[PDB]
Amino acid sequence: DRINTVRGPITISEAGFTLTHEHICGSSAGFLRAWPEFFGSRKALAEKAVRGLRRARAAGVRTIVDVSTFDIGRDVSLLAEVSRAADVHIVAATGLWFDPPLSMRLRSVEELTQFFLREIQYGIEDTGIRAGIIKVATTGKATPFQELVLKAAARASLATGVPVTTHTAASQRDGEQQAAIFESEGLSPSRVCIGHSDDTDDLSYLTALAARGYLIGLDHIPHSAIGLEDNASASALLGIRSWQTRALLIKALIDQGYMKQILVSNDWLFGFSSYVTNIMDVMDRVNPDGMAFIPLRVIPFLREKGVPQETLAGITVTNPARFLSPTLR
Amino acid sequence: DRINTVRGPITISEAGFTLTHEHICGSSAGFLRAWPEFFGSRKALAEKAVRGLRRARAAGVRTIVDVSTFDIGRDVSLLAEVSRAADVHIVAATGLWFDPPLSMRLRSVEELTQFFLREIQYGIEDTGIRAGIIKVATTGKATPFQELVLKAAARASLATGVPVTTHTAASQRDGEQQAAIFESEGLSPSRVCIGHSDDTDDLSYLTALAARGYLIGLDHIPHSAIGLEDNASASALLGIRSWQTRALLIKALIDQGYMKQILVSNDWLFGFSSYVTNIMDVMDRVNPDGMAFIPLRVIPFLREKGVPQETLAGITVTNPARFLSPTLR
Ligand SMILES: CC(C)OP(C)(=O)OC(C)C
Ligand SMILES: CC(C)OP(C)(=O)OC(C)C
Ligand SMILES: [Zn+2]
């Protein structure tokens, strides 16, 4: 019925055009509060985000899902402030990424479940703001600990109806292992989005998952270091595939009949401390459009390639709504 | 002249009897704020802390140095509140322990130096509370990252006059490698305390460091899993040496003429999320006196073994004062 945002619940219809995998800032737990100057200042970062969000809004974006977890240094108060200022709905997340500290690493599946439930039902920290999605991650074969996270994610999802979204090493076919664990927990694939999937050309892997009912997250569209092979770091992070290559995966999937399972995003951010210093400058240079890249560049591209507008609408509006709506078995 | 506490600056004479290595809570960055229930509640935690500190106070303790760093989940606000409620001075720290997140791990020596200076000169987070010591750590051979931390620590210390305190794997003689790094930066050994030193029976290793001017932190006195071998985790953590054995190392160093180089503490805490669940219960069983363990058990013990009261005062009052007084080269 309603979706939880950092400004409160909204109805499904209010979501509109939704960006399913983004971040206001890519950092680490407590970092923003401890060293705000790393980003110039907390104010500068907030202003940058507001400007960026206003531009996306102008382009038609109504809602963004910030998949930053506790370990990504998610600052809900920051999200709330920019959401209000830019007038864009922001869905917050619970879960864990791949940089959990000891206090989390030593927890049991039952403990983690309570933590995720807390964030979803009671709210994040003492803000009362509730998470509307669960974010998990692997980078190749799951670690024992990651396995636990995935199972807790599944349990929390089963109890609340909130969807699960993931970070993968697409090349390594991570999605397969992820799906296995989720299924082992009784989780419906329809409540799951396998992300960073445009990161591989293996359409075999993609349609497999798709065929199984999973949602495929093509959210790295603008990530490309083409013309930046000069920069090791950037190259490592962005890849050398062009944006068009990635964009074409969307078309392929549609072509195979999997339009209802696609989710597109940019995996953009306004601040990034969990990487080399100054990487942001590099990113901004690569994609000055920021989060508006999708509506301004990708949609028209697909249009020109033959994709019916109607279909594009389904992918950017219908799919996200369906995915985000809390649903129990 | 003055020492920075969580309630502000105090004169040296005001420190009095000081415990140089303690913790209010052992956690991780942002954990206490995101999952207070882990400790029952923040209120419960604070109360436990206040009680414990009042007991130590009753015993004669005037000041404690909380060596919790950003990665130990140090919460200065929590420190300030308990300090106020118990009426015990608390010195906060900057530096990094062994659980740094990606945002920290990827920083250069220069960046780290900045961060450390920030905490000491400007203050922690947005509180204005300034650190009065730098905490570093190794657990066996230093990692490349740890070497940078050590260098930054030294530079920050050289610029401010604030002492450096460390966590070591004593049995592995970590102190030797730490000293080497420090000296390479030009730091005076007299500004450094090599901690967890009572964790080894190798007096030769201890005396060699003392001879060089370093301070030796005998801060694990009450850590003993004796009579609990039935518990792996605990044994693993506390060891099987008796408190008397550790205490005797204090007398040994004295006997060898290094009384001015000794610092003693408990390495106690009131909450501990960075270990197995329920570890606190075990610890409280092991040492019901908590931080008062030193004045209530150790001092008397030492007296009884021939250590003159005066010497005992020098160790618990004078050494810490000299150590803590910001001192530039
Ligand atoms: C740190 C990088 C290498 O991983 P990623 C792309 O998931 O980071 C998020 C936080 C944007
Ligand atoms: C986590 C343990 C094993 O290391 P330690 C003794 O430095 O922890 C402190 C911060 C209480
Ligand atoms: Zn990711």
Ligand SMILES: [Zn+2]
């Ligand atoms: Zn992401």
Ligand SMILES: [Zn+2]
């Ligand atoms: Zn330690």
Ligand SMILES: [Zn+2]
């Ligand atoms: Zn300690």
